[PDB]
Amino acid sequence: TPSDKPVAHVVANPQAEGQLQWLNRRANALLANGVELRDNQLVVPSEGLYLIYSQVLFKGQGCPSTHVLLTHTISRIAVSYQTKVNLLSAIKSPCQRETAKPWYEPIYLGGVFQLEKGDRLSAEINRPDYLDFAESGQVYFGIIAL
Amino acid sequence: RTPSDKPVAHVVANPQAEGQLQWLNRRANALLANGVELRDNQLVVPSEGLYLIYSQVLFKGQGCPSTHVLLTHTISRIAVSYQTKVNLLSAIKSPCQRETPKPWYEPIYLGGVFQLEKGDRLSAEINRPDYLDFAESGQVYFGIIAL
Amino acid sequence: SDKPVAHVVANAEGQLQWLNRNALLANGVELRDNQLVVPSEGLYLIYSQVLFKGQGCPSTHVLLTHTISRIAVTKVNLLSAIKSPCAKPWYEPIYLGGVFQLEKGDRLSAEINRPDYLDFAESGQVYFGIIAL
Ligand SMILES: O=C1CCCN1c1cccc(OCc2nc3ccc(-c4ccc(=O)[nH]c4)cc3n2Cc2ccccc2OC(F)F)c1
């Protein structure tokens, strides 16, 4: 008997230039048991405890400057409050000393949260141009009802 | 649907308590469920088994100082049968390669899967709370999830 | 509990070999040929962590990769990431995890490209697991 757990696993569009865009209509990606993908946000169908997780992989060609900053943030908007709050957020200086060999920064973010029916979750970054799409499974965003 | 019964916790750094690292579950988007407690800044495991522990602290500094900086983040475990701190996980980072002749950001991620015992006390501590960053929620958290 | 479930850990020499002997392996999941075999079509949470270590930075530029693959009941990346670590020692884990609709009889691999940089001190940080939803 299949699970009725609301779940989703969405992957980033490699040819969406200038943006981090989630897709479900791709191999090994899904929306099930009521989770919707609307306006690039995962929409929660029922209240409960959820795992929420996201991966982005950044790459640079050497370190031209010590100043490049990288950000990756999961956000929540609850229907009652109509406000947008970070659940999980990382900021990273990839370059300590100026350089030209390629560098990589994977950021995985996850945890368990109390969510409400109709919440909208978003997973966002500051620099889509630094995203790497060399192989599949490098940029994803999901939730799993516990 | 039947709400899960697995013990889980996600506590966040108190953003009001600068100069300190104080964990809260009484804060937006933080929680304890199914017997996990937060007591004396420590997570307390209600039942035996494998748990995921996960955690992030975010550090930030303005340029680089004279005295070389090391940042440490450590997760340790006090057992009822052995009530002194045993480190389970630790990580360090030198945020600074040379003294500045510009902000830097250094997240430390730290987590793993461990056999825990009922009544285990879990602490997540850092050496440099003056470099810790709470400017926004979601940067500093500490959680466990029973397998 | 009846739900398929597995938590295996690494051992061995120059390889990433998964063992079922702080580990689990129940309810129809099998560890065959270093891959996990799915006993029934359904939704699964799949996860892993590997930890790399080294001392100082060599003159050849090392890339660390770690990947979980689906082997149909062809081989496809489900989860994958890359780190660039560069005579002081250094430590670098890689995290993977997500939910996936799987078919009965699929296999799952979790592999690294440089077993020579693998660690075996923190048993808590080298593992590979699944749980049926
Ligand atoms: O500490 C930090 C800071 C930043 C990242 N990080 C960290 C530390 C360790 C591992 C890790 O990722 C690998 C990992 N090991 C697991 C071991 C066990 C489980 C698990 C969860 C539920 C369950 O019922 N059984 C098993 C999940 C694991 N994951 C992925 C993961 C981590 C956190 C939240 C959710 C999630 O899964 C996602 F939904 F798919 C990440």
Numbering used by the authors:
A (entry chain B): 7 to 105, 111 to 157
B (entry chain A): 6 to 106, 112 to 157
C (entry chain C): 9 to 19, 22 to 31, 34 to 85, 89 to 101, 111 to 157
Text from the published report:
Tumour necrosis factor (TNF) is an important therapeutic target for treating a range of autoimmune and inflammatory disorders. TNF is a pleiotropic cytokine that exerts broad functional activity via binding and activation of two distinct receptors: TNF receptor 1 (TNFR1) and TNF receptor 2 (TNFR2). The small molecule compounds bind in a pocket at the centre of the TNF trimer and stabilise a conformation where a single TNF monomer subunit is perturbed, thereby inducing a molecular asymmetry in the trimer which in turn affects TNFR1 receptor interaction stoichiometry and subsequent signalling. To facilitate further characterisation of these small molecule compounds in a variety of contexts, we here generate a monoclonal antibody, known as CA1974, that selectively binds with high affinity to the TNF trimer–small molecule complex.
Structures of TNF in association with small-molecule indicate that the normally symmetric trimer becomes distorted, resulting in a breakdown in trimerous symmetry. A prominent feature of this perturbation is the generation of an expanded cleft at the altered interface between two of the monomer subunits (subunits A and C). Overall the homology was very high, with an RMSD = 0.43 Å with no significant variation in the degree of distortion at the A/C receptor binding interface. Variation was seen in loops containing Tyr87 but this is perhaps not unexpected, given that the loops are flexible and poorly ordered in the compound-only structure. Whereas in the structure with Fab and receptors the loops are stabilised through protein contacts with either receptors or Fab. This suggests that the CA1974 antibody recognises the true small molecule-stabilised form of the TNF trimer and does not induce significant further structural rearrangements as a result of binding.
